[model samples]
Target: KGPAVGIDLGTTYSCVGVFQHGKVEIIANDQGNRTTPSYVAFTDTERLIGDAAKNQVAMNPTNTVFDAKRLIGRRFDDAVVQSDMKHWPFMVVNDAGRPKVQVEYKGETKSFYPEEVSSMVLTKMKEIAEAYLGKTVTNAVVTVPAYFNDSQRQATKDAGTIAGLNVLRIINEPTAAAIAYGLDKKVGAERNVLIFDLGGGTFDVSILTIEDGIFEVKSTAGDTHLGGEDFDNRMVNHFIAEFKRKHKKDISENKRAVRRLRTACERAKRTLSSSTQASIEIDSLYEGIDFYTSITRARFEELNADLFRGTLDPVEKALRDAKLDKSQIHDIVLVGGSTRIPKIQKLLQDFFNGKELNKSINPDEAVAYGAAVQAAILSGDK
Candidate 1:
């Protein structure tokens, strides 16, 4: 019941926030950004995080594990891991007595549990909160995706433990976002809100009702396998085909090259979302041919239209689970970085019959902001 803080431990980005001056403000990391990379890299001398870890991805693609969020709290026989092993560049190895993500680092074989990798990210978030607040952060309302099952939720809590924080409660990603919206509006109505969260690692839809400072999540569903990562995968396949057509050889033959192409494709995907056209350039991937291509925005939409359609399924399911039609919802609030695409917004506008949607807060930062507000509320500050 001291000063409150919130943590959004995301798959791609992690952030911390606190309620101050009657408002929720995100506390930046040492990099002066709202969120830090959800990645950790081991080096000969020490470890790296955030920008530092991301910078080393090209050279040590096998070592820098980015989506540990997907593996955290999973079992040794998890279906996702079994399927993912075929695509993952690193080996799925065992540690001491339990199976975990394994890779050779600095000429020595090592393994890490998903929780261990998550702790690296959580530790960084805790460090920033401690510095910005100038006080110890003992209790926090850490938020996760609404679709996370018991094991996934427990993994998040365990990460908090490894990072030295007392997690007061594990908040659903959408519900946490609703708290941010309700608190921001200072509303007391029993109004329904749809929360669409599309992040680097997962997509979640939730229907929530807010009344008299209480946020009740009515229903939720999502595909943990969908998000920015899938987009990257799609682009990777497209580029691989293009390279094969031009070179008369399978670009998939080179493991390291394939990894680099995935990285480049991800960059191109983000760029093309905002730009009408995108040019990709990658070196050392092919012998004579450079990994370069120009993709138009129209093509991007055409390629992803089916994927966009896939998203609507959960939207409908969320409404159905809440026992309400789409018309009853007051507004839809978008969260996650992937929602920045113009086409995604267009789809939302069309689905809601042009009903006003809230974009007042950055989709990428909303979850973390909500987490911080709850942190303050739990700390008895609000």
Candidate 2:
């Protein structure tokens, strides 16, 4: 018997799930991590994936490829790709006008397609599934953003194919989340659900209607460039400016300094989610200089106020496109790890006129769980 697995091939992280014994089980990688960072690092003699790859990003900035989902199947001339080139430290070259990563490793310069990088992440997920099942698993249902175009969806499927898996279905992320919600809650009435998914690298707001066990997506809107990573970038810039003001040095020129600052910012951001204030401290961040600062939740929110506001446009547009008002949405479901921030939840609550969002589902694992449920259904498993 073939084991059924589901893959959530996300922009910043990817997860694998297997349907076994009437339930969905999240499979952990060799690192004992259920979600693996979607990053790949090229060394002189070896390639690294997941946590290993993410750890070497600062040391091998030029040879590490990350956030490849934004460039996959996209042309260099595309507006999003053009914007991304300005932010990424790794060299992005044009391969027949398509965006490709240029890396010098193992004594040779090479360009890799975005799908190839994605395949490495998918392959890691496949290995995790095989290890958990103690068998070779070949079939899977992969989830993607609802707004992904034909080319983007095809690229995702192609990545899975290269990973040696039979891609059975390419389902939308929001739709998959709804499936998990419906199954867990056992809703039987006509319901309107708005899924707000703010992942590490992408933002999507989708309006869905469920009736008689059928999920109908009403409208979708998103910004491929807006996400938690963008917030981290804002904090990184803030720290860079602070470092320059305090030491009269521009450290952004140094990839190591910037990478250290980004790591500090990420830690501070997560800390502020639960604490009122967080400190960013890095000894010898640049030029043997020590850095220290404290950021209150109030100040942090003020710094990224514009970014927070940016997410609301898509929510408004999605409702308008669906021909429904905020009051019409009966259930507001939040998906993606970024939604764990209190400010995001408060914003959505305000937009919904003090309505409480359904918080029963796990934000980081909901998409994979729903994908597993779909895989189980396809495999004729209960």
Candidate 3:
């Protein structure tokens, strides 16, 4: 019998953890990274996953699939999926009205369900656990977004099944965060928590109340298509327009240039979170032209002002649905790696009238940790 594990199946990244020595320990992948990029790439001879696959995205945009979560279990005719297609360079085809990926693999064209691609990421997580435990661990608890409908949740479970694991449970992302936050605190302590989760590819706000060791979700609201990727895309668009103005050519049609610009923008997004300004310079962006620019934090905020505001509505809706006022939320829990952004923090603080947001847990690892706790309980290890 192998040890059970908890998996945070994020749209942008995935992480796995197991309970050990009375606490949860995140199991790093073979790359020695705590989190793995949720990406997959197929070539003529082999398939690649995680960072290896992400590295090839620029060179194999059509064959490399990332952000498939946006389409997983969704119909091809889904308005959201149709809108999302415009952002990706890969081929998305309607298979009997269902969304599917078309890619060239092993010298032949192949079509795959979005869950099939997601399973590849899950399989990687399973391998990581088996390697660390020195056994074939088969049981897991996977976390998903709170707003995921029945079909989406079922698709997530299907991905886990295909990965050769028995998914013990499917927990909401905010619920998992609440578990990670409240489990270690004093029992019978009561508090209302607002979980603000903004990951790389999804944004959600959940309101929950914890009392006497019980955690109950009051309400949830989110935009499945909003996240850090959108923020990065804003910078990409800015660069594209600037490049067009300087060189008098539209690089939007050039995949390589767009990919390079995206890479730089992601780095700048992280840098500006800590500094007031960041520089973006890419050699050979297109047609022997080098792209160079510097973006101030003010400009970055201005570009993504609407997006930041977009998240606020969900927060308000969740609070409204819960019938709770902002002052009633005792704890403002910040979840997801994207919450590290200074602007995000400030916006939340301002909305709550300067309430001190909880930053105690590791934002990136908390969900997996909470999942691990649930896994332990389900496995009778706690």
Candidate 4:
């Protein structure tokens, strides 16, 4: 029998893991990171994936693809695709109603379904695990968003199959996070657990109860477009507007400049959570002139005032569907990297009347860790 692995095929990033002796251990990529960008790039002579693919965006924007999950199984005419098309940098054209990514690779025009791009990323993750474990991987448990529809789930399964993985199980993102918390792995507790999964591209709130080694999802409520990227967009606009007002010109029209600023703003957002001030200085942001700006933590909250509060509606709604009050929610766990924001954590903690949001698990690795836990059980691995 081949080895088993867990894959978190996220919209913005992906992660892989496997059981290490008695515990789950995340597998780092060749780049030495536990997570890889869900990105793929094609060049004239060479193909690139992960971090190498990301740099291609600076030169070959159209041929490089990211956010494949957004269009994976939806029709081109779907409102979600229509709304998302503009924000996407790559060319997407209709192929009999399907959104096909069109690109020029090896001097020939080619088209890819979203599923294929997803498979490429999965392949990269697969190799990372294989290299580390020195064993051929055959079984996999992939995680998906709870809000994904039927076709979406099927498409994801096909992606895993294309990557040479024997699709073992398709677990919901929140459910995997719950398992990673070891809620059902231990012998002692029957707990009503709530999972706050605010990731890179979307926000999900789910409530589940674990009883006698069984876990069932009580309900799920979410805002599909609300996430950390939304916050980053806010910051991007603030700087764009600031540059326009200060320089007497608009850089928003310049895609290259905007992309550079967006990347900088993302890094700034990461540190603004811990640092009171995030100072940003960019080269040639507009008209061959350098720019400098500093943002305070207070301003970030102000920019995303309504969004930070938006999480609570679905949280309350999730609790309502379970016929449970806030007090009945025995534990709350945070999942996805975006949940690291101070304002998000504070808002959630206060919402539950000061109950601690569990930090026992790293939000980024939790889903993959839980998936690995399942893989170990199914493979009968020691």
Candidate 5:
């Protein structure tokens, strides 16, 4: 038998982990990063994935494909799909009611099912794990959004198959985080745990009861279309509007310019989470004009106030479905990078009546860590 691995096929990033040396470990990719971007690109000479793909996104917006998770196992006519298309610069078409991406490579236009792009990301993750461990890997436990239906789960498994991975299990994102929490703490006590998973493109809230290192999911509610990406778009729009107001130039109509602005906006969004002021500076951003601006943490929070508050509805829905009150949620386990936003944390603290949110494990790697543990169990690792 070969080694087993865990994969978090996220909307914006991906992480792979393994259970080894008596514990779960997340191995770095060949790029020396713990998390790899969920991106793929096709060019004239070769294909690219992960960081390389993300780097060329602005320059090759149409050929660089990201966020395939939104389209996988979903019909093109779905409301969510239609709404999300507004943000995508690439093209998609309905193929027998399912969505397919169209990209150009080697002087020809090629169509791909969403799962195919996802498999490419999964393959890179598998490569990273194999390259790091110096061992063969075929078995893996992958995590998906908790709201994924049976068809979506099957499609995810098929993605692993295309990646040459034998997906042993398809787990839920929030549940995976819960496993990492309970297993890490080994609490042996019982409590109600609410997992808030807000990643780049998906948000999920799962309510669970845990005792003796095990968790039973009571209910799950989420908005697949809400996440950090929306925040980035808001920031991008804010900057674009400012640029137009001052110079009377509309850069929003230019895909390349908007993509560049979007990148800077996303970087500022991350920086604002850690610092009071973050600046966005781009040379020749539009019409040979240098663009520079700064955003205050206060302004950032104000700009996304609605989105921050939007997360609460899913939490309430989950609690309502579980037939529990907000006061009864013993612990709120934070998952996904978006949880790092202070505004979200503050709102959560206020909503939970000043309860401290759980942050024992790194949010980005929590889902994969739990999957790694499940892989260890399945592979008979001690």
Candidate 6:
């Protein structure tokens, strides 16, 4: 068979791409969607993967594993992992003194190391590649946040191996994006570029300078816990408070309810981006309280001010670490779906004194496309 595929196994979504039939195309999943929600649900019979898993999460909150990217390859005792354990719905049990994710099914319980959970997603991506290309995919590249440390990077590689993919390289998220942008441009123009990556589970700011495909990452900073999910969480809280006010009982205590609430809140957040108001349903939360709140962009901005504030510090920190001012940046590029927040663009535009930020690339797929491009190269494809 020819070389395999490039996979961007992101926190929120997973995508696979390979050069095929005179061009490159990202393989679509069962729903003919280019991106599959990075979620997995364990059941008595078999595991529900991707969008199916995402859809079943609210129903089976206890068995669904999402955002394994944050805890994969981490020690259970590690401070960050431990902190996350407190909030994560699934239990972070220990096996042989290492962290493992556990979910109960059919009155018995099973375990999955973070690697194992991520592996399921990766395996699904490879399955798509195999179906689309009519070949068994073995070699691939995977991208992680630029700020991911040694252990985290290694963990990502382990997940790939467990999924039966021969990881050709573990690439930096922003650096991969830069390669995609730089390679498409002229051969030798050195430019200081900023990559603002806001993924489902993390927010990262990377400052890099590229000349002739040699991209030097000057500095990186981020909030490992901030992203669209957190935004969803905040919105959930707002709606829950409104629900309690109208119906008079706290619904945040129920994980199952909270899970459904989170979905409604996330959909509302997306909807309110276009409409002035979006309705959300909260079922069985309280007597006589069926539908409670109508969220608006104005309300979302007010609720997410702290989240927006959290993002600015890292941008400033990245600039400081790079030993440069906003004026020194030749261009600012937004990556990840979270950057779609209009407030994010307006803030950056104002912060840089109205210097136009280049967004010629689609934020949702840029990181994944770049990752595939690098994977093709690293695998020694001509």
For TM-score, the strongest prediction is: 4
**Model 6 error, position 130 (Å):** 2.9
- Between prediction 3 and prediction 4, the one with superior TM-score is 4
Which candidate tops lDDT? Answer: 4
Residue 49 C-alpha lDDT in model 1: 78
lDDT of 1 by residue, 260-358 (tens): 887777777878767898888886687766666777778777778888777888988989989999799987999988888888888877878888777
Model 4, 1-382: lDDT tens digits are 5679999999888999898779888988887888888989989987899978975566777788988999988999999899898978788999998999888899998999999999999999999999998998888999898777889999999999999988889888888888887777656567799999898888889998888878788899988788878899999999999987888888888877877888788889989878988989998888898989999999988999999988899999999998899999988999988888899899999999999887777788899999999888888884
Query: How badly does each model clash, as a count of residue pairs?
Result: 0, 0, 0, 0, 0, 0
What would you estimate as the lDDT of candidate 6? 0.80
**What overall lDDT goes with each candidate model?**
0.80, 0.86, 0.87, 0.88, 0.87, 0.80
What lDDT tens digits, residue by residue, belong to model 5 across residues 149-181? Answer: 998999889999999999989998777887776
Estimate the TM-score for candidate 4: 0.94
Clashing pairs in 1: none
Decide which is better by lDDT, 1 or 5.
Answer: 5
lDDT tens digits, residue span 205-224, model 2: 99988887777889999887
- How well does each candidate superpose onto the true structure, as a TM-score? 0.88, 0.92, 0.91, 0.94, 0.93, 0.90
Per-residue lDDT, model 6, residue 306, is 76
TM-score of 3: 0.91
Error (Å) of candidate 2 at residue 266 is 0.8
Model 2 lDDT, residue 36, Cα? 87
Candidate 6 lDDT over 158-190, as tens digits, reads 989899888888888787676556533545767
Q: RMSD in Å for candidate 5, one decimal?
A: 2.2
